């Protein structure tokens, strides 16, 4: 399945990502250092750009 | 969709022809000096791989168009098609039954008092041929998508036919290529009769040696007394001159004509004997010519069928042309390899009663045949496996069976070639089934 | 130029879901532009040659 | 009342496994029974109108 | 002739209508959340 994510700040492909929340839609950003990431970028995603998370 | 493509892609220029012309002080390139547009014939001389866009010369907004659509057809054939021996729709297996000559007995009457009704079975050999190739070819024609590729209905219908011509030109090629595959199969199985030559490209002495061994070989294959020396089943048989075929490549024909058959006043005395069939070549290393009968190819047809279906969601057709056909080799034909490389001394050991069925406790005589290309001794070492209970073969091919033998035997005749640090074996195997008996107690003295 | 293609092994099992699949034709092409534009020039006086 | 549908993007790669996919239409029904049932009575006495 | 050519030659945009369709969420572009070929039409539909 998949769901809509709103990105958060300049996602780069192949980088480790982590989720958060704000206004509504789950926000995606690069995972913080020294922890467990949630998702891997498959493509570059702009700061406030909506996209899909392919679960 | 192809932004930056130059006309020079796989071009591996030995020189610049334009710098050869304009910097020609004097050479053969001087004749291309007064050509007004030599530099434009130099650019688009070979065609272009990727069509760019050309603007018009007078009004640069207009795009210069394609004015002609040439659609190249090709009609490939199979040269080996004449070796195909029919077609069968029903059944799968083919059974070649071959009767062989026997060994005479010395006349004695005193031995003949008891051995009258004692029978001797014929030396009948049997070879089986199944269905091997079972294939289909697949081609899609997206009709509505290809209407962007064409602006003329006559051209469009001719291209669609060229795809359908390309399916039949595929089934022709594989049928050529499977029938070469049998020859390179049968060579690597060690089943041809190797006659060692030197490479005929290397010398007109080595060429003239080849045609002498060729015409000697083809004459030996057709003798009335027959020969065991030229089969893989090693049976006494003969061939005919109308049956022989020769499968040389196109190299040997050119050195035959120019060097040998030219200066010869009588072409009937140096021509290759029998029918000569020209192919591109064999994929074995060292194998140059092959001399077979037409019986050596049992190539029959079981099925040829093209079937179509149309996809409505994706708007295309699919062309399933099905080829099911038997591609087998009769091992009863004379069939001669002409190998120019270094060969092993022994290529095949043949234990000619391959199928045997000995009663439990009963005897059996086995007879090993050796294909010696070094023409040397190569003593047969006998062996019996799989029935490791009490009994096995002698040293000269006599199978002994114990009374508790209950397992299908395997009788091995093995020629030890190679060096002492690493022997390599050439093995002949025959199977023995044990049909048991009765009327015996479990103990004796 | 329309080129020739491959063999697939017959399999009635895999032919249950692999109907209607796609196999692309092998097709190559070439494009030839107009190279030569030539132009020839001769004059005849026709009266001074008399 | 049949109703409109959505379009699907032409793709030969997704059409290969979906030749026989179903798509149920959008039909809505409505039902209308007889409601009114009445009569209009008028008496005309001739021979007194004459 | 003309190697380096983009379809956006000579165009300054007020916004991206490609991003306005994917990031709609009912913000007046909800009518273009269908139309499976909306990107292909919006790319070359200006000529």
Query: Which candidate in E30, E31, E36, E41 is best for mutational testing of the D interface (most D CBs within 10 A)?
Result: E36
Query: Which candidate in A44, A50, A52 is best for mutational testing of the E interface (most E CBs within 10 A)?
Result: A50
Are chains E and D in touch, 3+ Cβ pairs below 8 Å? Answer: yes
Please list every residue in chain C whose beta carbon sits closer than 8 Å to the beta carbon of residue B37. Answer: 35-38
Positive or negative torsion for Cα B368, B371, B377, B380: negative
B147: tokens are 């209407």
Total CB pairs under 8 A between chain B and E: 11
- The angstrom resolution of this structure is 3.2
Residues β-bridged to residue B385: B410
| Contact present, B125 and B100 (Cβ < 8 Å) | yes
B289 CA: distance to closest CA in chain E (Å)? 55
Residues 6 or more apart whose CB falls under 8 angstroms from that of B56 comprise B62, B63, B64
- The whole-angstrom separation of Cα D3 and Cα D1 is 6
Kindly tell me the burial class for residue B288, based on how many C-beta atoms sit within 10 Å of its own C-beta (0-12, 13-18, 19 or more).
Answer: buried
Contact D18 B145 (CB under 8 A): no
Are chains C and E in touch, 3+ Cβ pairs below 8 Å? Answer: no
Residue B86 in 3-state DSSP?
A: strand
SS3 content of chain B, % helix, strand, coil (to 5): 20, 30, 50
Are chains B and A in touch, 3+ Cβ pairs below 8 Å? Answer: no
Residues 6 or more apart whose CB falls under 8 angstroms from that of E11 comprise E46
Contact D13 C22 (CB under 8 A): yes
Q: Which residue of A has its CA nearest to E23?
A: A50
Please list every residue in chain E whose beta carbon sits closer than 8 Å to the beta carbon of residue A3. Answer: none
Please list every residue in chain C whose beta carbon sits closer than 8 Å to the beta carbon of residue D12. Answer: 22
- The whole-angstrom separation of Cα B311 and Cα B308 is 10
Determine the distance from the C-alpha atom of residue B389 to the mean position of all C-alpha atoms in its chain, rounded to a whole number.
43
Give the alpha-carbon dihedral of B420, B424, B428, B434, to 10 degrees.
80
Residue B169 in 3-state DSSP?
A: helix
Q: Which residue of D has its CA nearest to E36?
A: D9
Tokens 């990105």, located at residue? A7
C5 CA: distance to closest CA in chain B (Å)? 6
Total CB pairs under 8 A between chain C and D: 10
Please list every residue in chain E whose beta carbon sits closer than 8 Å to the beta carbon of residue D10. Answer: 37
Q: Which residue of A has its CA nearest to E19?
A: A49
- The whole-angstrom separation of Cα B180 and Cα B278 is 12
Contact D6 E37 (CB under 8 A): no
Please list every residue in chain E whose beta carbon sits closer than 8 Å to the beta carbon of residue A44. Answer: none
Contact D17 C22 (CB under 8 A): no
Of B52, B39, B309, the closest CA to residue E1 belongs to B52
Interstrand relation of B133-141 and B297-311 (parallel, antiparallel or unpaired):
unpaired
DSSP one-letter code for B257 = I
Q: How far is CA B263 from CA B41, B56, B209, B256, in A?
A: 45, 62, 17, 11
Residues 6 or more apart whose CB falls under 8 angstroms from that of E4 comprise B3, B4
A55 CA: distance to closest CA in chain E (Å)? 19
Please, what's the b/e burial string for B297-335 (b: 16 or more CB within 10 A of its CB; e: otherwise)?
bbbbbbeeebeeeebebbebbbbbbbbbbbbbbbbbbbb
* Phi, psi of B221, deg, nearest 5: -70, -15
Of B100, B120, B149, the closest CA to residue B352 belongs to B100
Please list every residue in chain E whose beta carbon sits closer than 8 Å to the beta carbon of residue B50. Answer: none
Contact D13 C21 (CB under 8 A): no
Of B307, B322, D17, the closest CA to residue C10 belongs to B322
Residue B33 in 3-state DSSP?
A: coil
> Read out DSSP for C1-50?
-B----EEE--TTTTTT-TT------B---B--------------SSTT-
Residue B130 in 3-state DSSP?
A: coil
Please, what's the b/e burial string for B264-280 (b: 16 or more CB within 10 A of its CB; e: otherwise)?
eeeeeebbbbbebeebe
Q: Dmax over Cα atoms in chain C, in whole Å?
A: 94
Name the residue facing C35 among B44, B166, B174 (closest C-beta).
B44
Residues β-bridged to residue B141: B317
Contact B3 E3 (CB under 8 A): yes
- The whole-angstrom separation of Cα B117 and Cα B341 is 53
* Residue B296 backbone zone (phi > 0: left; psi -120 to 50: alpha; other: beta): alpha
E39 CA: distance to closest CA in chain B (Å)? 16
Name the residue facing D19 among B142, B145, B312 (closest C-beta).
B312
| Contact present, B221 and B239 (Cβ < 8 Å) | yes
| Contact present, B163 and C25 (Cβ < 8 Å) | yes
Please list every residue in chain E whose beta carbon sits closer than 8 Å to the beta carbon of residue B4. Answer: 3-4
Name the residue facing B318 among C2, C20, C30 (closest C-beta).
C20
Query: Which candidate in D9, D10, D11, D14 is best for mutational testing of the E interface (most E CBs within 10 A)?
Result: D9
Please, what's the b/e burial string for B339-349 (b: 16 or more CB within 10 A of its CB; e: otherwise)?
bbeeebbbbbb
- The whole-angstrom separation of Cα B302 and Cα B134 is 9
Please, what's the b/e burial string for B200-213 (b: 16 or more CB within 10 A of its CB; e: otherwise)?
beeeeeebeebbeb
Q: How far apart are the first and last CA of chain A?
A: 5
Please list every residue in chain D whose beta carbon sits closer than 8 Å to the beta carbon of residue E37. Answer: 9-10
Question: Across D1-50, where does the E strand assignment appear?
Answer: 2-3, 26-27
Residues 6 or more apart whose CB falls under 8 angstroms from that of A26 comprise A3, A4, A5, A6, A19, A20, A53
| Contact present, A6 and A25 (Cβ < 8 Å) | yes
Tokens 């058959």, located at residue? B261
Total CB pairs under 8 A between chain B and D: 20
């Amino acid at each position: 399945v998949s769901f809509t994510a709103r990105a958060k700040s300049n996602v780069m492909a192949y980088r480790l990502l982590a989720y958060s929340q704000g206004d509504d839609i789950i926000e995606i950003s690069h995972a913080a250092e020294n922890t467990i990431p949630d998702y891997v970028a498959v493509k570059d995603v702009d700061k406030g750009d909506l996209t899909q998370v392919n679960m | 969709t192809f932004n930056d493509v130059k006309t020079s892609l796989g071009i591996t220029e030995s020189y610049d022809i334009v710098n050869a012309i304009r910097n020609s002080q004097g050479d053969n390139f001087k004749s291309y000096v007064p050509l007004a547009t030599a530099n434009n014939v130099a650019e688009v001389g070979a065609g272009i791989l990727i069509n760019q866009t050309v603007q018009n010369d007078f009004i640069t907004s207009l795009v210069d168009r394609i004015g002609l659509v040439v659609i190249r057809q090709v009609s490939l054939n199979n040269p080996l098609k004449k070796f195909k021996k029919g077609q069968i729709p029903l059944g799968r297996t083919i059974e070649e039954i071959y009767t062989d000559i026997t060994k005479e007995k010395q006349y004695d009457a005193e031995e003949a008092e008891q051995k009258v009704f004692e029978r001797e079975m014929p030396n009948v050999k049997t070879l089986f041929h199944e269905r091997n190739r079972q294939g289909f070819y697949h081609q899609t024609i997206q009709d509505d998508s290809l209407k962007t590729a064409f602006v003329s209905w006559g051209n469009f219908e001719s291209f669609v036919s060229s795809i359908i011509n390309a399916i039949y030109n595929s089934a022709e090629v594989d049928e050529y290529e499977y029938m070469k595959l049998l020859v390179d199969n049968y060579y690597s199985k060690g089943l041809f009769t190797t006659v060692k030559i030197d490479e005929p490209t290397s010398s007109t002495g080595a060429l003239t040696e080849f045609v002498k061994k060729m015409r000697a070989t083809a004459r030996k294959l057709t003798l009335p007394q027959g020969s065991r020396d030229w089969n893989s089943m090693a049976v006494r048989t003969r061939s005919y001159m109308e049956d022989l075929h020769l499968i040389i490549d196109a190299d040997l024909e050119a050195e035959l004509d120019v060097d040998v058959l030219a200066k010869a006043f009588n072409m009937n005395r140096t021509d290759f004997l029998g029918n000569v069939t020209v192919i591109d070549g064999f994929a074995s290393t060292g194998l140059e010519a092959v001399l077979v009968d037409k019986d050596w190819f049992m190539v029959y047809d079981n099925l040829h069928k093209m079937e179509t279906v149309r996809n409505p969601r994706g708007l295309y057709w699919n062309y399933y042309y099905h080829v099911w056909q038997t591609l087998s080799v009769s091992r009863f034909a004379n069939a001669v390899a002409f190998v120019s490389g270094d060969v092993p001394a022994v290529t095949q050991v043949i234990v000619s009663p391959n199928i045997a069925a000995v009663k439990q406790g009963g005897q059996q005589q086995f007879t090993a045949y050796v294909r010696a290309t070094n023409a040397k001794d190569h003593k047969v070492v006998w062996s019996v496996e799989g029935g490791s209970t009490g009994t096995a073969i002698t040293g000269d091919g006599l199978l002994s069976v114990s009374g508790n033998e209950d397992n299908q035997l395997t009788v091995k005749a093995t020629v030890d070639i190679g060096t002492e640090d690493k022997p390599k074996l050439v093995v002949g195997e025959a199977v023995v089934s044990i049909r048991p008996n009765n009327a015996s107690g479990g103990a004796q003295a």
